[PDB]
Scaffold this active site. Sequence first.
Site, mmCIF file in Angstrom:
data_model
loop_
_atom_site.group_PDB
_atom_site.id
_atom_site.type_symbol
_atom_site.label_atom_id
_atom_site.label_comp_id
_atom_site.label_asym_id
_atom_site.label_seq_id
_atom_site.Cartn_x
_atom_site.Cartn_y
_atom_site.Cartn_z
ATOM 1 C CB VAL A 84 -1.083 0.181 1.142
ATOM 2 C CG1 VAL A 84 -2.142 -0.985 0.956
ATOM 3 C CG2 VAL A 84 -0.192 -0.048 2.582
ATOM 4 N N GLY A 85 2.123 1.010 -0.503
ATOM 5 C CA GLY A 85 2.913 2.428 -0.726
ATOM 6 C C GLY A 85 4.124 2.405 0.179
ATOM 7 C CB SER A 86 7.069 4.417 -0.112
ATOM 8 O OG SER A 86 7.321 3.653 -1.412
ATOM 9 C CG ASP A 115 5.886 9.553 7.431
ATOM 10 O OD1 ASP A 115 5.593 9.585 6.157
ATOM 11 O OD2 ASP A 115 6.081 8.425 8.183
ATOM 12 C CE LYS A 133 7.774 3.370 8.747
ATOM 13 N NZ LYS A 133 8.162 4.772 8.377
ATOM 14 N N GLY A 183 10.827 3.573 4.366
ATOM 15 C CA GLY A 183 10.452 2.063 4.395
ATOM 16 C C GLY A 183 9.209 2.205 3.496
ATOM 17 C CB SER A 184 8.059 -0.229 1.267
ATOM 18 O OG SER A 184 8.265 -1.446 1.835
ATOM 19 C CB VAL A 185 3.310 0.551 4.157
ATOM 20 C CG1 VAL A 185 2.509 0.276 4.978
ATOM 21 C CG2 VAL A 185 4.195 1.797 4.793
HETATM 22 N N1 LIG Z 1 -2.392 2.237 5.089
HETATM 23 C C1 LIG Z 1 -1.674 2.647 6.074
HETATM 24 N N2 LIG Z 1 -2.169 2.649 7.245
HETATM 25 C C2 LIG Z 1 -1.559 3.079 8.127
HETATM 26 C C3 LIG Z 1 -0.194 3.654 8.167
HETATM 27 C C4 LIG Z 1 0.370 3.628 6.715
HETATM 28 C C5 LIG Z 1 1.727 3.950 6.582
HETATM 29 C C6 LIG Z 1 3.014 4.241 7.353
HETATM 30 C C7 LIG Z 1 3.069 3.503 8.821
HETATM 31 C C8 LIG Z 1 3.795 3.967 9.931
HETATM 32 C C9 LIG Z 1 3.804 3.291 10.951
HETATM 33 C C10 LIG Z 1 3.542 1.936 10.863
HETATM 34 F F1 LIG Z 1 3.882 1.276 12.029
HETATM 35 C C11 LIG Z 1 3.008 1.355 10.009
HETATM 36 C C12 LIG Z 1 2.726 1.989 8.777
HETATM 37 N N3 LIG Z 1 3.970 4.872 6.555
HETATM 38 C C13 LIG Z 1 3.404 5.374 5.568
HETATM 39 N N4 LIG Z 1 2.210 4.883 5.575
HETATM 40 C C14 LIG Z 1 1.412 5.625 4.343
HETATM 41 C C15 LIG Z 1 1.288 4.667 2.962
HETATM 42 C C16 LIG Z 1 0.564 5.272 1.967
HETATM 43 N N5 LIG Z 1 0.433 6.728 2.213
HETATM 44 C C17 LIG Z 1 -0.516 6.876 3.296
HETATM 45 C C18 LIG Z 1 -0.001 6.226 4.642
HETATM 46 N N6 LIG Z 1 -0.569 3.102 5.593
#
Ligand SMILES: Nc1nccc(-c2c(-c3ccc(F)cc3)ncn2C2CCNCC2)n1
Length: 347
Positions: free
Chosen positions: A26-28, A164, A49, A32-34
């Site tokens: 679901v994106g960066s 962030d 992440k 890191g990446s998520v």
């Molecule tokens: N879909 C989603 N839901 C919650 C958070 C995030 C998230 C995190 C993140 C941070 C900490 C963590 F522990 C886990 C994930 N970092 C960036 N994103 C983004 C991913 C794409 N843009 C919107 C949110 N993404």
Amino acid sequence: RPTFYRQELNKTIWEVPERYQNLSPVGSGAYGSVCAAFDTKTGHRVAVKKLSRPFQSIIHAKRTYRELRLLKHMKHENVIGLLDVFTPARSLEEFNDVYLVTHLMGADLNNIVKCQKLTDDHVQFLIYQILRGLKYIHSADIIHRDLKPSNLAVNEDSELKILDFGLARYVATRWYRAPEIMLNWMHYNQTVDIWSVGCIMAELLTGRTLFPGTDHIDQLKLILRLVGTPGAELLKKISSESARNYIQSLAQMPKMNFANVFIGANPLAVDLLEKMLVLDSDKRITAAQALAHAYFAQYHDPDDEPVADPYDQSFESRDLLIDEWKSLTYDEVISFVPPPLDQEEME
Ligand SMILES: Nc1nccc(-c2c(-c3ccc(F)cc3)ncn2C2CCNCC2)n1
Ligand SMILES: CCNC(=N)NC[C@H]1[C@@H]2C[C@H]3C[C@@H](C2)C[C@@H]1C3
Ligand SMILES: [Ca+2]
Ligand SMILES: [Ca+2]
Ligand SMILES: [Ca+2]
Ligand SMILES: [Ca+2]
Ligand SMILES: [Cl-]
């Protein structure tokens, strides 16, 4: 001990406990990446992440520690916090990967305003939540510094969380950045984030970016057309003589009446924007003051706008070796205590 499994996501191996299933990218995120996932322990949807190369350099190692410490501290419904943190490593000697887990939020704020004329009541709710989260982080002496719609995670019911924040000690948008940050002015305060809120709120109300500058000069000119030319007192904050000379040389422009800019908006929204979009950062409304503004009257609840516990940032001034940051990070992974699933009670 939990059993881990491996899966290639975003062209790299993820190694996660079997508790987390159905991983999908679901994106960066920051550093890191998520992936979205299903937590089989609780039936909840989560976001995981994977930090990118968390200990490759002293810069990565300290930012890994910084992010883990910050996220372990943040316990607020409008701020990203932690459900879990894990590593496939069995010992410090093996430790090279860090995964952070939070509640899944499906969208960002750009997804809320893009294809929807928001009602004023809905805009109130979105901005209220940003300000509630900011009151909390600011109360721990943590500033975002790059608040923007893509840093606001939103779920299917328009519940919002700031993410962030407190980071950074790829080309980003600068359209929401406070002028004192964008132009490297010598000193600034927590209200840098309030400028960003004003830019976001303006765009939610009109559907148009407030200051879509092509470069830092064009963005400054757009800002000054709205807020008027600043006084000499503001030059005090700018180190570069060339920049001061340039700004001073601009033709004098009056401040616009925001009621003539945001035609048809709730007059309370216009008044709030006037209090946020001020160049004098000492003159800018704070998050706590904004929560008391009549624009949020139907949402405001002083018993549900908490501040943060004190946050010890003494590590920020310290230069440690990579292995020291790594060991400190490992300690924080091991000591993490997952919160209760239900942490709230009826008012
Ligand atoms: N879909 C989603 N839901 C919650 C958070 C995030 C998230 C995190 C993140 C941070 C900490 C963590 F522990 C886990 C994930 N970092 C960036 N994103 C983004 C991913 C794409 N843009 C919107 C949110 N993404
Ligand atoms: C994408 C659409 N957004 C804009 N064109 N913003 C720039 C305008 C606004 C900010 C300054 C004062 C007014 C209102 C006139 C301009 C400069
Ligand atoms: Ca309430
Ligand atoms: Ca809930
Ligand atoms: Ca409950
Ligand atoms: Ca109450
Ligand atoms: Cl602490």
